[PDB]
Amino acid sequence: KFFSYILVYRRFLFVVFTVLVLLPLPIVLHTKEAECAYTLFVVATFWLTEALPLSVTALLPSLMLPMFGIMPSKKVASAYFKDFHLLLIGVICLATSIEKWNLHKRIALKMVMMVGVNPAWLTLGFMSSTAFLSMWLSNTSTAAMVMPIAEAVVQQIINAEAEVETKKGHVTRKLTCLCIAYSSTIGGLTTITGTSTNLIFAEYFNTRYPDCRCLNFGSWFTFSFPAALIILLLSWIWLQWLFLGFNFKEMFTVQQKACAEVIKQEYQKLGPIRYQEIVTLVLFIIMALLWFSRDPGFVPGWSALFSEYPGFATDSTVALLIGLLFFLIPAKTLEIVAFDYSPLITWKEFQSFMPWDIAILVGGGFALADGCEESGLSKWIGNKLSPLGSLPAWLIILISSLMVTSLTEVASNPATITLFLPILSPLAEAIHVNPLYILIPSTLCTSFAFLLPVANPPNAIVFSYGHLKVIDMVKAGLGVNIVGVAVVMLGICTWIVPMFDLYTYP
Amino acid sequence: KFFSYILVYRRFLFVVFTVLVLLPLPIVLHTKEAECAYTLFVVATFWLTEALPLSVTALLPSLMLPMFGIMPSKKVASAYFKDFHLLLIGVICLATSIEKWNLHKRIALKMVMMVGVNPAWLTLGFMSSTAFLSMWLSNTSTAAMVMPIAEAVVQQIINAEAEVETKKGHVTRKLTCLCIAYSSTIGGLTTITGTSTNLIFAEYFNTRYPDCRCLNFGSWFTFSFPAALIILLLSWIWLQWLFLGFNFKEMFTVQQKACAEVIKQEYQKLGPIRYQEIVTLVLFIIMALLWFSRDPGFVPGWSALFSEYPGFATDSTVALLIGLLFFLIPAKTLEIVAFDYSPLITWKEFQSFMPWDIAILVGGGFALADGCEESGLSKWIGNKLSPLGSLPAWLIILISSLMVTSLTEVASNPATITLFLPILSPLAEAIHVNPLYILIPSTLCTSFAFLLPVANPPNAIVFSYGHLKVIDMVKAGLGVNIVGVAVVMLGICTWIVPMFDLYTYP
Secondary structure, X not given: OHHHHHHHOHHHHHHHHHHHHOOHHHHHHHXXXXXXXXXXXXXHHHHHOOOOOXXXXXXXXXXXXXXXXXXXXXXXXXXXXXXXXXXXXXXXXXXXXXXXXXXXXXXXXXXXXXOOOOHHHHHHHHHHHHHHHHHHOOHHHHHHHHHHHHHHHHHHHHXXXXXXXXXXXXXXXXXXXXXXXXXXXXXXXXXXXXXXXXXXXXXXHHHHOOOOOOOOOOOOHHHHHHHHHHHHHHHHHHHHHHOOOXXXXXXXXXXXXXXXXXXXXXXXXXXXXXXXXXXXXXXXXXXXXXXXXXXXXXXXXXXXXXXXXXXXXXXXXXXXXXXXXHHOOEOOOOOOOXXXXXXXXXXXXXXXXXXXXXXXXXXXXXXXXXXXHHOOOHHHHHHHHOOOOXXXXXXXXXXXXXXXXXXXXOOOHHHHHHHHHHHHHHHHHHOXXXXXXXXXXXXXXXXXXXXXOOXXXXXXXXXXXXXXXXXXXXXXXXHHHHHHHHHHHHHHHHHOHHHHOOOOOO | OHHHHHHHOHHHHHHHHHHHHOOXXXXXXXXXXXXXXXXXXXXXXXXXXXXXXXXXXXXXXXXXXXXXXOOOHHHHHHOOOOHHHHHHHHHHHHHHHHHHOOHHHHHHHXXXXXXXXXXXXXXXXXXXXXXXXXXXXXXXXXXXXXHHHHHHHHHHHHHHOOOOOOHHHHXXXXXXXXXXXXOOOOOOOOOOOOOHHHHHHHHHHHHHOOOOOOOOOOOOHHHHHXXXXXXXXXXXXXXXXXXXXXXXXXXXXXHHHHHHHHHHHHHHHHOOOOHHHHHHHHHHHHHHHHXXXXXXXXXXXXXXXXOOOOOOOOHHHHHHHHHHHHHOOEOOOXXXXXXXXXXXXXXXHHHOOOOHHHHHHHHHHHXXXXXXXXXXXXXXXXXXXXXXXXXXXXXXXXXXXXXXXXXXXXXXXXXXXXXXXXXXHHHHHHOOOOHHHHHHHHHHHHOOOOOOOOOOHHHHHHHOOOOOOHXXXXXXXXXXXXXXXXXXXHHHHHHOHHHHOOOOOO
16 A cells, blocks of 8 residues: 555656755755756756656756856756757758648658568668768758658558558557667768768867868768768667567568558559649758758858858758748639638648757757856866876777767767867877877767767657657667777777878877 | 739738848948848838748748858857746746646636626726736736636636627637736836836946935835826726727626526536645745745845845746646546556646747747847947937937837847947936936836737737737737827826926936
8 A cells, every 4th residue: 555655656756756865966065066967967867767758857957057056047048949949940841841741651652662561671771861861961950851751651551561451560660760860870970071070070180280181071981981881780780689570581472462552552542743742842852952062071062152251051041941931832722712822831730740849858958068068067077087198098998988978968969079079189199199099989989879868969859759768769779889889999999090090109 | 813813922922022122221231230120121021911920930030140140040049049938938837737727717717706797897807917916026927827817717708608599709808818918017117126127227227326326116116106007097998999899888687697697607517626726726826926025126035045146046947946846746646556647737738838939939039139239230220319419308208218119129128228228328418417317218118018029028928829910919009009108208297207306417
């Protein structure tokens, strides 16, 4: 009876318990920087296990930081909405129009009819298509662009799986939705301009080491692509082992032919292409073209036209420019022709399907990361790393890499690299080592953020579709993170040494 | 035929037409500050007439400002979410819980049974209750607190209006919802701490004029209360004339007794008070008590406990502290007692009913106002006001007041007063006038923002309930604004002179 009453109110007692058991941390230590650490720990605890909704926990920094006095409440709110959110709004305008006019169904049906009958080949194609798309545009962009296409397939197959007749259905969508989530190992790891994380490292290295010109397009690709391709293959194998069954004989019947017949029957039921779908594709192509042609890295883009105020027109402005066009392009006239036309999507359909959860969730991560920088916590973490020069060589690289992938879980990737790079680059110079030997494993491991939300906004976009179980991706994340880290260390010691001369002092 | 085709696509052609007809403004004038003015005009044009959705137009500054180079896109996004939005989120948590557990229906039914059978007495009571509530807490706070209560009455009366049996229904809800919108003439006009707008003026006057101690509680009230009470009465009369019928004999039958019987019958149908409603009331009282006791102005509040980092804990933190409690307080257990309890409101019910329209809309106003300050536009406006010292006296006061109520339409009240106060206070000193004679009409007229959204966040909260027709409140706003301004000028010349000696040089 009494023990049962504790079990039913697990969340209420746990929330109270963790606050009071962590409560000695602020009062003790003379209230210097443990307040930020206490706030970081309690928010992280509520993120690992769902004691509170994920978006609700993101609003906790708006409470603890002002009361603790780390930063004013006015500055906390300003950190909630940032450049990523404008990018999210613009893409969702296109995403809403794709679903509203059944453009996703036509694309999914066309994809299935051509190839991809066996489920194992679907996730292989999904990873390859998303990773190659993530090669040029962005990790954040490619996550929200193919996700409406990706879901259209897996909801399609389960509907066609009836064959004129349920745990298999849910595990399949968790796998494929996570395939795009983890399809970032090629998104900027292999290209200098793929993500802003490596861009910060590249511009910093040129600034502080003008003499060195090794960091250039064609030299970053020639070593990362063989390395990053390894993660993609083992991630496919590991995800196939964790979800569904992994049998080697399956990849190398009546149900297959029956599924093909019903799939092709549905495609004919859709009929000819419609005007609304064509316009959505046209805006889809233009949005991708402008993102790719902004900063290709080898030929100047349209940013050279605006080469007077640098950094003012980011990728989010492109998303908004094409995204807001969906609210004023005519769709269907309202033959009386009584009053007026209708736009492609009205705001009512945009208010729904809009990940307001992610906007608050990612905002909490930005505010929590900003609070860590305002308080003397990030500097304290860097200070403890300084007495580590006595270690031979390979240790430090492993220590930093595991440390890099751990502190990027609660902070954005650009913030994490900018913090550590100054801590790390000097450590490098002090020892007689190539400063590069330490920077490359650190900057490459920043992108490896596969645990929890807020760590990587591509992961956050995945949470927006309702299959937001954190325990599933935490279990999958450790497998990918260990695989991702291990391949990096294998690359550093074996393949990356000879061309940049990692043993010799530059 | 051809003329008909223009009429159906009115919005599409108008949006294109206004952009191109205003397009000469940036290119001409050597591209110095007309870019901000062009952005301000096109956004205002789309706000007056619904060429685009109100929230969509709020995202236009995120486009024009980065492309025009006024401010980077990173800074534009940071201005979208501010201290007001955290206040909105906390209150909506309470507002959602009130509606979910039918607390609004019980309050509305109890209000109707006691008094208020005639519709004219309802809006008089609604104005008086909201204005007195707005006396202490805030204009923003009181707008969202009584609105769920206010709607509960008017939806109740129309349901009870059947009498065992439609344009009257919609006009009634537009009136009463607007009553709280315009019930801000007592919200901070009569009290120093009612709103942040007068607080900025009070702290500025003490800083630059330490010798003067006239600005104090009991001296601001003794002159504003007789003045502000006049606006409330004429606003009630003017709104009664514009909406419904205004007959003097109505205020001073079978339908009335039938309405009473069905109203009291519904109250018995609700039954006894429930546990969920009691908890909501308890959190309702605590939220109001903390807001009132933060800075009463005459006895130090709980901010003296946090009197080490001033301004860190604002009113929004109080809203979040009580608002987030609704997500973890048990409501009903899920007698197997299988898994766990349920909170008062889950996030699914918070995602709905949440004015995401207002968050984007008000954010656009903040970003647009910030862009005006970044570009040399606000300073340019102040510069043109400088050559006005030759005017005798009463003119300038009228010029500023109409100018104050015009430039606060597209800017927040604290931003508008902080801009003008420096422009105006020196003008005052230069002429031999009480500097005060100019400051009081200017600072009091800042609050008079009854046209369009974004001008006053209390107006924005009104838009959240769906009766967001701008043309109705623009028509009503001019009547209130002229009434509001005229009473102020009458107060300045007749009643406010004798005690502060407005004719003599201080």
